[PDB]
Amino acid sequence: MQDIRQETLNECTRAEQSASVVLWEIDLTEVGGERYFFCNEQNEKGEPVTWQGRQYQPYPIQGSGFELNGKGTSTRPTLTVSNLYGMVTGMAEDMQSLVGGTVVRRKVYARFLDAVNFVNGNSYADPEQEVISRWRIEQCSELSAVSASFVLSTPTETDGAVFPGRIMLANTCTWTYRGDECGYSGPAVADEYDQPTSDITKDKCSKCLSGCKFRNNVGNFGGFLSINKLSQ
Amino acid sequence: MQDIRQETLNECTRAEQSASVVLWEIDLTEVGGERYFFCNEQNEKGEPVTWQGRQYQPYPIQGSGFELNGKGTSTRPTLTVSNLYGMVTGMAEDMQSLVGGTVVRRKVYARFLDAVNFVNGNSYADPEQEVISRWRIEQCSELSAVSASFVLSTPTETDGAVFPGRIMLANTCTWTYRGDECGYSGPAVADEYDQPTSDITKDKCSKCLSGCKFRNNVGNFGGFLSINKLSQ
Amino acid sequence: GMTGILFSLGASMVLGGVAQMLAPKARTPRIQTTDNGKQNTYFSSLDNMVAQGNVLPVLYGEMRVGSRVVSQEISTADEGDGGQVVVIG
Amino acid sequence: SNYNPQTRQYSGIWDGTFKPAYSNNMAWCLWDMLTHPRYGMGKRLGAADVDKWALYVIGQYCDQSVPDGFGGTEPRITCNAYLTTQRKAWDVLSDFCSAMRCMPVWNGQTLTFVQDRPSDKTWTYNRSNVVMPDDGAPFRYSFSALKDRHNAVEVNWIDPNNGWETATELVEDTQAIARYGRNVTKMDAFGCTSRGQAHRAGLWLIKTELLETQTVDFSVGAEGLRHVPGDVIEICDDDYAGISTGGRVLAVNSQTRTLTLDREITLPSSGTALISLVDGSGNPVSVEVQSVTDGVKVKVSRVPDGVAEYSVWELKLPTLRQRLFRCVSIRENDDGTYAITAVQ
Amino acid sequence: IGPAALKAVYDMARKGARDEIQTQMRDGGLFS
Amino acid sequence: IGPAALKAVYDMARKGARDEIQTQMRDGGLFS
Amino acid sequence: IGPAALKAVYDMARKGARDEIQTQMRDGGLFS
Amino acid sequence: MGKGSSKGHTPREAKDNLKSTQLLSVIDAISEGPIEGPVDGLKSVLLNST
Numbered sequence A, B: 001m002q003d004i005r006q007e008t009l010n011e012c013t014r015a016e017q018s019a020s021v022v023l024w025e026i027d028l029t030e031v032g033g034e035r036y037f038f039c040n041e042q043n044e045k046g047e048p049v050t051w052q053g054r055q056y057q058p059y060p061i062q063g064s065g066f067e068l069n070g071k072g073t074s075t076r077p078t079l080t081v082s083n084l085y086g087m088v089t090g091m092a093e094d095m096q097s098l099v100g101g102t103v104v105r106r107k108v109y110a111r112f113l114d115a116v117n118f119v120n121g122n123s124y125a126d127p128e129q130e131v132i133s134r135w136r137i138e139q140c141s142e143l144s145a146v147s148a149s150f151v152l153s154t155p156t157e158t159d160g161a162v163f164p165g166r167i168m169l170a171n172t173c174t175w176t177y178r179g180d181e182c183g184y185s186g187p188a189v190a191d192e193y194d195q196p197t198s199d200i201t202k203d204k205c206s207k208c209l210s211g212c213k214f215r216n217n218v219g220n221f222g223g224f225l226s227i228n229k230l231s232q
Numbered sequence C: 001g002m003t004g005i006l007f008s009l010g011a012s013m014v015l016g017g018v019a020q021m022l023a024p025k026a027r028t029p030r031i032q033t034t035d036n037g038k039q040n041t042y043f044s045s046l047d048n049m050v051a052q053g054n055v056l057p058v059l060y061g062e063m064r065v066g067s068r069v070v071s072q073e074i075s076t077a078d079e080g081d082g083g084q085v086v087v088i089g
Numbered sequence D: 001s002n003y004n005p006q007t008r009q010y011s012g013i014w015d016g017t018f019k020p021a022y023s024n025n026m027a028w029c030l031w032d033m034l035t036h037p038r039y040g041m042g043k044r045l046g047a048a049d050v051d052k053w054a055l056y057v058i059g060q061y062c063d064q065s066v067p068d069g070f071g072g073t074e075p076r077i078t079c080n081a082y083l084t085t086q087r088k089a090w091d092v093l094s095d096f097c098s099a100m101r102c103m104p105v106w107n108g109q110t111l112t113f114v115q116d117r118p119s120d121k122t123w124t125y126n127r128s129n130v131v132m133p134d135d136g137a138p139f140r141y142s143f144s145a146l147k148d149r150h151n152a153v154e155v156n157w158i159d160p161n162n163g164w165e166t167a168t169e170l171v172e173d174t175q176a177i178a179r180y181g182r183n184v185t186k187m188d189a190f191g192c193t194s195r196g197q198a199h200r201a202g203l204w205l206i207k208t209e210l211l212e213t214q215t216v217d218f219s220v221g222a223e224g225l226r227h228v229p230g231d232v233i234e235i236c237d238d239d240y241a242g243i244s245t246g247g248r249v250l251a252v253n254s255q256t257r258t259l260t261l262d263r264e265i266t267l268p269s270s271g272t273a274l275i276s277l278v279d280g281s282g283n284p285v286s287v288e289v290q291s292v293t294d295g296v297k298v299k300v301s302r303v304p305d306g307v308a309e310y311s312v313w314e315l316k317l318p319t320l321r322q323r324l325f326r327c328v329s330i331r332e333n334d335d336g337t338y339a340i341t342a343v344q
Numbered sequence E, F, G: 001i002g003p004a005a006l007k008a009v010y011d012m013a014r015k016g017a018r019d020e021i022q023t024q025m026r027d028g029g030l031f032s
Numbered sequence H: 001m002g003k004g005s006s007k008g009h010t011p012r013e014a015k016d017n018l019k020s021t022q023l024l025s026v027i028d029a030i031s032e033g034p035i036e037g038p039v040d041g042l043k044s045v046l047l048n049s050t
């Protein structure tokens, strides 16, 4: 079942429907950007649509192909955004072509927007009735000088991933630096090529036996010292 | 880079270009035929087009889908020739359906044809300004009483070929007769079967041990006499 | 006359990868469970094979490797390599 | 003949002469593979169907004395193959061509090979030289995919030191781990016989896959179609993406004050330098420094060549600008006598 | 007319798909 | 109108190709 | 009018078949 | 020694009273075309990895 309130479900029974409104939120905090709020249309005052107090500005956005299924391939709906004045290209050249971000689609009925969107003022406003979905941007299939097409995907979709992440190595580590297994917290001692530096900005392990010996954590080495198992 | 001369390269950028002429040469000498020169167009005097001194007779022809690529399958452009009066059928039943021949496509700008193609006489003539391509006919996909369609392919295409071309061993030889590896140059002694003969017309080798014994040439036999390695 | 439907395909090719647009990438062999967990090399054959199915191979440098045996035969040897030194006792 | 097979030193111009000698060079090994009687598909293609000069350039580039981890000096790629199983010729050719990071193409009625060697610009394109479709914009860009961008690679190489057994070497980047996800990919390093070569191949794959991430397709008139043969390097300067005025065909020019009358409102640099490049008679790229823009519309060049007539296209180059390069990969020919170019 | 055009387009699409399958399975391509 | 016709043909050439893929792999086809 | 429409539909169907093959060869789906 | 053809042997230790000995003789095919000889003199031949 869905988290649909009783009031909106009851309203979604009558013949004389209201106007469906779709609003989009592009979240880039996890990738290094900001939160952008878009709406396909504006109110009667020629103003950004106000919902839950926040404002969605008008911009041509169109999402097509939302197909949830359990078999076959995954779902890859398409989002089209007008690229005029180079606005999309500006963030694309900066945010690595909008790869890894999140998109949230909220759909609302017209009779529940804030009262400031209507000259008479809606008395039926209720800023808690909407339907929410989230997806992740996969690629920018085409961004011309007039438009831009993004492919969407489910966050939990598996593609190109293998289950047994463990890999057996001979003289190379397998985990990160200082994360969980390299319980190192002392001063910087080494760098990429195992040089005796003492600066923290250049401290990165070489993923070798010599790096471990330098950092005195050879007891936590991921590379088994077999090597000569296939020669004999 | 291409071998295009400077002057034609300069002319190609002009805003007011001239007509583009395409001329085709079908060479079957490697198969046992002749050289045919075709041009889709003629001059203003109703005469075959004269280029570099030779004459390309007017005849229906049209090339389509000329593509060059490095990834995926090798491109196969097509050629269409009108088969009226049975002209194509006249050589199809004689030249084994034009399989294995060569086609040469030369493109030329109209302002460089010989002076005899113009009533006033072109003064800007240069018989060494053209672009040349060569392909090989692969099959005659369509042949009717109105037209004929040929498929073209690159000479270097590696479809249906295996790299190491040796069978190592057998009861039979795996070479040619009187080549540069068999090394036989004597008089005729044997034929397709193991029958004595003394005529050069029916000199043939069964490519078995008996043939070598007949020809007193066993040290050049290309079959290792193992047999029992597979059994024992 | 006109030649419509160009249908640019620059986007479709990248769908399989970008490094493949400049390099065809090396082929990889399959894994046989019977051959334990060893990985087969595509350019070296240490084991000495049987001269039959395997095509006459080619060498390109170094690589102590096996072969394709054409004839194996075991008999009784002679007592003495040569010369007049032919002592037994 | 010019090639010494011991120290790998070239001395003089090379002619179409071959001598029998021992070698372990990858390019010439491929050349032997392509053309040879008996087993080397010699009865299928001749010796004139393959671009031997491209092979010579590849072989010259192969030996560059890259620095190894052990402090030694070794050639970049060493040919070591023992093919002992029958397989499709196309597959063997692709495996050979994947080591030297090359790609084969039927260019100029000859089979040639191209690679990602840093080279110079060949030709320039802007809005005037390209044609837009009915949509409105002529350049169509595209990018790679999140899960398509690999950053962890395992390479299988034979190890002569221990037992001539296979060994797997891992290469990855921490910053790519932080930015994108972890994408593991396996590929054997064909012909490898040293850890340094396998590591170099893996690093090349990850770096090429991380940096080259943009592909643009567009169209070009007849002149450009005849100009670029295939797999060349050109600049595609676009004022739409650059939110500036990159330059286009100038209308008329003069000679006394060298008053060049363009058709777009240009904009000079702040205080350092700026140049403009036009074409001449033999289609060169003549560059001229610019001092002052008279009337915001008219240009004043120093030494213009009296060969520009009306259709010369000018490109205006400022400083501190990341010039955009492109390598053409796909070229398509249609019956309207325009070409479709897809480049990276 | 509707149904005739629909059936014609469907059959032409089937022929095109068959031709694509045939042409992509030769030596290279994506080897469908 | 153009884009409606193009989208219609594109979506019509989908199930045709899917059915072709499915039938050519069943018993005696080319297995896609 | 005539064969122009046929050629247009043929190219469109070939493109659709290519896209279908690509999308069905992926991890999910029937692995064509 | 290299060039195109070569031969070599090691002095056998044998004899010590009348007996009989076996002799395994085997021919192997390595590659095709004009190959270069072993990198070393004669110790390139490895029987049971020695």
Ligand code: SF4
Pocket (backbone or CB within 6 Å): A173, A174, A175, A176, A177, A178, A181, A182, A183, A205, A206, A207, A208, A211, A212, A215, A217, A218, A220, A221, A222
């Ligand atoms: S190698 Fe030793 S030090 Fe470097 S990361 Fe792995 S464990 Fe931590």
Ligand code: SF4
Pocket (backbone or CB within 6 Å): B173, B174, B175, B176, B177, B178, B182, B183, B184, B205, B206, B207, B208, B211, B212, B215, B217, B218, B220, B221, B222
């Ligand atoms: S069998 Fe003996 S004779 Fe007949 S071809 Fe082979 S080698 Fe020459």
